[PDB]
Scaffold this active site. Structure first.
Site, short mmCIF file in Angstrom:
data_model
loop_
_atom_site.label_atom_id
_atom_site.label_comp_id
_atom_site.label_asym_id
_atom_site.label_seq_id
_atom_site.Cartn_x
_atom_site.Cartn_y
_atom_site.Cartn_z
N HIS A 66 7.50 -1.91 7.13
CA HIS A 66 6.41 -2.13 6.17
C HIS A 66 6.15 -0.91 5.28
O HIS A 66 5.47 -1.02 4.26
CB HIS A 66 5.12 -2.49 6.91
CG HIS A 66 5.28 -3.63 7.87
ND1 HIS A 66 5.09 -3.48 9.23
CD2 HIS A 66 5.63 -4.92 7.68
CE1 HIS A 66 5.30 -4.64 9.83
NE2 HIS A 66 5.63 -5.53 8.91
N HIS A 96 1.23 7.06 5.80
CA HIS A 96 2.20 6.11 5.27
C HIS A 96 1.94 5.93 3.78
O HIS A 96 0.96 6.46 3.25
CB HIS A 96 2.17 4.77 6.01
CG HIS A 96 0.85 4.06 5.94
ND1 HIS A 96 -0.06 4.08 6.97
CD2 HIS A 96 0.30 3.30 4.96
CE1 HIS A 96 -1.12 3.37 6.63
NE2 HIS A 96 -0.93 2.89 5.41
N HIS A 98 2.17 3.23 0.11
CA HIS A 98 2.26 1.90 -0.48
C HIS A 98 2.74 2.07 -1.92
O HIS A 98 2.33 3.00 -2.61
CB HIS A 98 0.89 1.21 -0.48
CG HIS A 98 0.31 1.00 0.89
ND1 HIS A 98 0.66 -0.07 1.69
CD2 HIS A 98 -0.57 1.74 1.60
CE1 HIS A 98 0.01 0.02 2.83
NE2 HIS A 98 -0.74 1.11 2.81
N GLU A 108 -2.75 0.46 -4.07
CA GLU A 108 -3.51 -0.65 -3.49
C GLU A 108 -4.87 -0.67 -4.17
O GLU A 108 -5.29 -1.70 -4.69
CB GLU A 108 -3.64 -0.48 -1.98
CG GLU A 108 -2.29 -0.60 -1.29
CD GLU A 108 -2.39 -1.15 0.11
OE1 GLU A 108 -3.19 -0.62 0.90
OE2 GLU A 108 -1.67 -2.13 0.42
N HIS A 121 -1.82 6.85 2.43
CA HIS A 121 -2.94 6.60 3.33
C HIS A 121 -2.83 7.54 4.51
O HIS A 121 -1.78 7.62 5.15
CB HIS A 121 -2.94 5.15 3.80
CG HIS A 121 -3.39 4.19 2.75
ND1 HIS A 121 -3.24 2.82 2.88
CD2 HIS A 121 -4.00 4.39 1.56
CE1 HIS A 121 -3.74 2.23 1.81
NE2 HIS A 121 -4.21 3.16 0.99
N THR A 201 -5.37 -2.33 5.38
CA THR A 201 -4.84 -3.18 4.31
C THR A 201 -3.59 -3.93 4.75
O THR A 201 -2.89 -4.52 3.94
CB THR A 201 -4.52 -2.37 3.04
OG1 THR A 201 -3.45 -1.46 3.30
CG2 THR A 201 -5.75 -1.59 2.59
N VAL A 202 -3.33 -3.89 6.05
CA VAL A 202 -2.21 -4.59 6.66
C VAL A 202 -2.74 -5.25 7.92
O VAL A 202 -3.75 -4.82 8.48
CB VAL A 202 -1.05 -3.63 7.08
CG1 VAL A 202 -0.39 -3.04 5.85
CG2 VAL A 202 -1.59 -2.52 7.98
ZN LIG Z 1 -2.14 1.74 4.24
#
Ligand SMILES: [Zn+2]
Length: 263
Positions: A66, A96, A98, A108, A121, A201-202
């Site tokens: 992811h 991590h 995005h 995001e 993040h 957000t996941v």
């Molecule tokens: Zn995140």
């Protein structure tokens, strides 16, 4: 093949399908959101961020399928976030990123209708009240996540340390030791921020996050960002699919208040 164990960002398992196995996806405090500066309110009670990140805390970088995850040893209290809108000490656990399929849309959180190229993040959990991340993740005051926007610009020497490892973790499940990571030097010089109550957000999309989104973005070259899109969301031995995009669309504000620590 969408399910409680298999979700992603593709047509069959993307964000629109997450509610199928994670009802909270339609909750009242979901993230990310669009930050409209016209609707933002300065709050003088918000405090400056107080940060300490030990370079030895980082231990491993891996491909979760992811995103890439830099996991830190959160069994010790060497790296913590304090201040800001937080009460107590929040221990560093993971970092991590995005991004999107193109440089024009990858972050995001959105600012005044604009998407940055990517968004970092930095996940922390309340170690004063909870025994571990798992239990903290199910409490409103359990998690604190710093969001840092990435915009295309000159090559970033700090991010390069991460990009240099990507080929070694191209496939989902791959991992490589990653330490002596000066995370603090990756953050922008200004620690001014926006804050609001939200969620992961996941999936599981738990509403336990106090979001701290820094106003100032950091730069990343188009080539460095492209390297992240070269990662696969599939494992060795499985049909290949590139992780070209891994950001969730903005969610309903539902009357929440976005506050600014600056004016
Ligand atoms: Zn995140």
């Amino acid at each position: 093949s969408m399910s409680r164990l298999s979700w992603g960002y593709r047509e069959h398992n993307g964000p629109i399908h997450w509610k199928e196995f994670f009802p909270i996806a339609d909750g009242d405090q979901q993230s990310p959101i669009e930050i409209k500066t016209k609707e933002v309110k300065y709050d003088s009670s918000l405090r400056p961020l107080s940060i300490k990140y030990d370079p030895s805390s980082a231990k491993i970088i891996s491909n979760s399928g992811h995103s890439f995850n830099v996991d830190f040893d959160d069994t010790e209290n060497k790296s913590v976030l304090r201040g800001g809108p937080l009460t107590g000490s929040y221990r560093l656990r993971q970092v991590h990123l995005h991004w999107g399929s193109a440089d024009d849309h990858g972050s995001e959180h959105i600012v005044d209708g604009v998407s940055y190229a990517a968004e970092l993040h930095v996940v922390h959990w309340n170690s004063d009240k909870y025994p571990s991340f798992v239990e903290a993740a199910h409490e409103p005051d359990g998690l604190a996540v710093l969001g840092v926007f990435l915009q295309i610009g000159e090559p970033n020497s700090q991010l390069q340390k991460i990009t240099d490892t990507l080929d070694s973790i191209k496939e989902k499940g791959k991992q490589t030791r990653f330490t002596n990571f000066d995370l603090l030097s990756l953050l922008p010089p200004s620690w001014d921020y926006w804050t609001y109550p939200g969620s992961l957000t996941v999936p599981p999309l738990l509403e336990s996050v106090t979001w701290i989104v820094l106003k100032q973005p950091i730069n990343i070259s188009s080539q460095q960002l492209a390297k992240f899109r070269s990662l696969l969301c599939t494992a060795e031995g499985e049909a290949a699919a590139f992780l070209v995009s891994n950001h969730r669309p903005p969610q309903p504000l539902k009357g929440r208040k976005v506050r600014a620590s600056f004016h």
